[PDB]
């Protein structure tokens, strides 16, 4: 076997280069204003004072915040980032093959793992000992060869995140599931409909009738004293979000810790 | 006695030839577009853009999927197929006259039964020992003369399915009950009504009035902001389905297993 | 007996060639824009400002996400893919004929199975020992001849997925049920109805009346301040989805693990 | 197995069909025939109509509605009759039982 040092092919296979984590963008996951506009096919949002359509700056803003919302509704790291963690010694888990659970998941790869004292490395574990479970967020060692806890004894560096899926309809455990993309889209869309709902009619109008010289024109709009212009669409989007979240909260497990 | 070898007249009587399982078709069970159209007597479904009636390809598609639905709402095999199963040794059931429950039921006939090791037949049981209970899905042997389980010791081949009934108003245990036909029809019909409900009026219209020169024409349709054009028919079909399913889930028993 | 090496005819029969997993497409499973459009026979989705029909790219996008949703509502792998797993040693299950449960199911076939240490094969199990249960997702060995667990001792490679069914109305345990196709169609159709429900009528209009020179028209739409234009169809589709999911969650079993 | 048609009016031997089971089967058929007929009483999907032409005016409200089909009432009454008949017949035939 030959490999780039930390990336032992069995225990810690390389999945991404540290150059690419700066090159990946939201558009590479398909989160783009064009996608949102596709879900709003046949609708246009424009300023009634000017006819100017809504700018892509707002779409990208909403998309980035929707990504943040998805990364907090589920205890996951969506976008690749380098994580550096100082983790505590606990006797039970240290005896359990040096078990540590990462704060962020999935693990793309582990970059460093050391036992240290005041920042001095006390031991550097050979990379061929590292065992990684990517979707779980678990790291262990399987060596080839006065208190129950102590703070910040373990130094761990790794890359968390998800890669864009390689094939249609499929994902590896380190690849973003196709439906989490749609969840993020639904979160963005729920904001865009709240903006659009103000502009279907003049402000605050539920009904109008206008008549001149016996020509009569009359509108009842979807606005009402209770419900906003986009109420129904938002309710449907919330139902879809609920189904998607149930599915994804079955894919990622329940959090647990041993005291 | 004389018989075709596997089909001992008492324990495993022949009910179908293996040539016929390729010749049987949905139409032989009476599932045909004409039957659906008979239940929709006095209605026609046609494309308003062209006046073309709906093609029989769609009816046959819906019928085949409705058959699949019926085969999953009940734990049954409707259409004849050859099943090959590798079944585990369990000590209690093996001592219980070599009891095995087939995964699919009814049994039309058993084709092979052997005890084997790495695909080598260790023993071939004489066909005169085979005892079959067709509707239950049970097979047993009644010989004329370090662990509690082991995987895939038993090799079983059989035909599952149901034959079309020979007489009006009657069925043998290996014949399709007359009302399961109607259940499959009701499942197809529930889709056809959902298609038809879009075409009774122009899209999205609940009311119209049109008046020209004092001639007045006015319609209230069965569409509404809540209920679709075929709501009532679907509700009635669901009631009928519920009664039929209760009856058929009394005919086939509750599933049970001994741990 | 003669066979391609890993694919022992009894324990691990070959069901697909590894060349075909690249060639299979959504269309081979009957998921196509035309299969969606058939369920909306007599409707067209059309931009009211231009008359252009919606492009099939959106249909394909929605279908691919609907497949992802179906693969998360049920704990299954629909489309064929090659899975590589490193699985932990557990003493109880290792003693239980080397029982391992795959993370993904059904198994189409097992490609490799080895016990290893730092990537070195410690033993390679003869293919004639492999016992596979395809729909369950179980693998065992039946040999011909200091801690309770250890990480990643077992190396398992296999193909998960389902093949398109070979006969009408029937599926083998490794073949897709006909009703799961309809489930994926219904998931796509729910989104297409959400899009179309905005376009049946002028945006945000619940009632209109126009009177000009002795011509009068009044229209009430299915849109309302509470309900969107396609509310009814979506509700019925949700009922159908619920029935299908109950059936399929009876076909696949409840998940269980021994702690 | 089976039943013979009864030999006297109003009476059945234990091997003869009860008169009310005939009515039960009739009611089951009739429920389907009413489902068919309930689509045809009126133009399909019409709940209200009004027409005014040259001083002739007609308005009709039908039993069809966005909730209920045209034959809803008859089907409901037939379901009540079926329920009574089934209670009676499930008193005539007993509860099933087996010794394990």
């Amino acid at each position: 076997l030959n490999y780039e040092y930390p990336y032992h092919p069995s225990g810690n296979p390389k999945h991404i280069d540290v150059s690419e984590i700066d090159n990946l963008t939201l558009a590479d996951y398909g989160w783009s204003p064009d996608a949102v506009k596709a879900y709003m096919f046949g609708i246009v949002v424009q300023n009634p004072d000017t006819g100017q359509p809504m700018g892509d700056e707002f779409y990208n803003h909403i998309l980035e915040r929707a990504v943040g919302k998805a990364e907090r509704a589920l205890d996951i790291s969506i976008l690749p980032d380098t994580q550096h963690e100082m983790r505590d010694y606990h006797e039970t888990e240290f005896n359990s093959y040096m078990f540590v659970h990462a704060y962020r998941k999935p693990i793309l790869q582990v970059e460093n793992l050391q036992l240290q004292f005041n920042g001095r490395p006390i031991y550097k574990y050979p990379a061929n000992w590292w065992k990684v479970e990517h979707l779980a967020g678990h790291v262990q060692l399987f060596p080839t060869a006065g208190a129950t806890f102590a703070p910040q004894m373990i130094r761990l560096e790794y890359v968390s995140g998800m890669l864009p899926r390689k094939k249609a309809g499929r994902n590896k455990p380190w690849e973003m599931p196709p439906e989490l993309e749609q969840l993020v889209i639904k979160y963005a869309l729920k904001e865009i409909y709240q903006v659009w709902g103000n502009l279907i009619i003049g402000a605050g109008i539920a009904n109008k009738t206008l008549e001149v010289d016996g020509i009569t024109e009359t509108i009842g709009t979807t606005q009402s004293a209770m419900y906003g212009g986009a109420s129904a669409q938002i309710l449907q989007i919330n139902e879809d979000i609920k189904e998607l979240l149930d599915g994804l909260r079955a894919y990622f497990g329940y959090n647990m810790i041993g005291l | 006695l004389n018989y075709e070898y596997p089909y001992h007249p008492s324990g495993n009587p022949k009910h179908i030839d293996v040539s016929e399982i390729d010749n049987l078709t949905l139409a032989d069970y009476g599932w045909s577009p004409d039957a659906v159209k008979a239940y929709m007597f006095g209605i026609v479904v046609q494309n308003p853009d062209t006046g073309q009636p709906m093609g029989d390809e769609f009816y046959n598609h819906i019928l085949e999927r409705a058959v699949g639905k019926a085969e999953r709402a009940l734990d049954i095999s409707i259409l004849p197929d050859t099943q090959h199963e590798m079944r585990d040794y369990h000590e209690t059931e093996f001592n219980s006259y070599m009891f095995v429950h087939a995964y699919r039921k009814p049994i039309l006939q058993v084709e092979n039964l052997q005890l084997q090791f790495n695909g080598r037949p260790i023993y071939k049981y004489p066909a005169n020992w085979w005892k079959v209970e067709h509707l239950a899905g049970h097979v047993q042997l009644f010989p004329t003369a370090g662990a509690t389980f082991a995987p895939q010791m038993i090799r079983l081949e059989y035909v599952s399915g149901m034959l079309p009934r020979k007489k009006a108003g009657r069925n043998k245990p290996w014949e399709m009950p007359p009302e399961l036909e109607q259940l499959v029809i009701k499942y197809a019909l529930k889709e056809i009504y959902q298609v038809w409900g879009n075409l009774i009026i122009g899209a999205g219209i609940a009311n119209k009035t049109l008046e020209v020169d004092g001639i007045t024409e006015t319609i209230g349709t069965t569409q509404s902001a809540m209920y679709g054009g075929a709501s009532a028919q679907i509700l009635q079909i669901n009631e009928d389905i519920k009664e039929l399913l209760d009856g058929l889930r009394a005919y086939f028993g509750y599933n049970m297993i001994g741990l | 007996l003669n066979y391609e090496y890993p694919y022992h005819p009894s324990g691990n029969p070959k069901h697909i060639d590894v060349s075909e997993i690249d060639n299979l497409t959504l269309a081979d499973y009957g998921w196509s824009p035309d299969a969606v459009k058939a369920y909306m026979f007599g409707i067209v989705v059309q931009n009211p400002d231009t008359g252009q029909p919606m492009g099939d790219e959106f249909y394909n996008h929605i279908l691919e996400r609907a497949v992802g949703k179906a693969e998360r509502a049920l704990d299954i792998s629909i489309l064929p893919d090659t899975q590589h797993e490193m699985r932990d040693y557990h003493e109880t299950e290792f003693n239980s004929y080397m029982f391992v449960h795959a993370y993904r199911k059904p198994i189409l076939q097992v490609e490799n199975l080895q016990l290893q240490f730092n990537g070195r094969p410690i033993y390679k199990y003869p293919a004639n020992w492999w016992k596979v249960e395809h729909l369950a997702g179980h693998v065992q060995l039946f040999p011909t001849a200091g801690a309770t667990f250890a990480p990643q001792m077992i190396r398992l490679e296999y193909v998960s997925g389902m093949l398109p069914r070979k006969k009408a109305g029937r599926n083998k345990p490794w073949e897709m049920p006909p009703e799961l196709e309809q489930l994926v169609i219904k998931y796509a159709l729910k989104e297409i109805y959400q899009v179309w429900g905005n376009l049946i009528i002028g945006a945000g209009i619940a009632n209109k009346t126009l009177e000009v020179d002795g011509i009068t028209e009044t229209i009430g739409t299915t849109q309302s301040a509470m309900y969107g234009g396609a509310s009814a169809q979506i509700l019925q589709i949700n009922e159908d989805i619920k029935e299908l999911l109950d059936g399929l969650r009876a076909y696949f079993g409840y998940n269980m693990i021994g702690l | 197995s089976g039943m013979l048609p009864r030999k006297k009016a109003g009476r059945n031997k234990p091997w003869e069909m009860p008169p009310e089971l005939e009515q039960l089967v009739i009611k089951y058929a009739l429920k389907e025939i009413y489902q068919v007929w309930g689509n045809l009483i009126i133009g399909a999907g019409i709940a209200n109509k009004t027409l005014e032409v040259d001083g002739i005016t007609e308005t009709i409200g039908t039993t069809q509605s966005a909730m209920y089909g045209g034959a809803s009432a008859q089907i409901l009454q037939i379901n009540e009759d079926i329920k009574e008949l089934l209670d009676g017949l499930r008193a005539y035939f007993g509860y099933n039982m087996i010794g394990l």
Partner: peptide, 20 residues
């Protein structure tokens, strides 16, 4: 391969009821 990402109904009088 790659993931896909970006009538007739007539009103008429009942003439028999008109005769009545």
């Amino acid at each position: 391969e790659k993931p896909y990402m970006i009538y007739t109904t007539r009103l008429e009088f009942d003439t028999i009821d008109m005769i009545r």
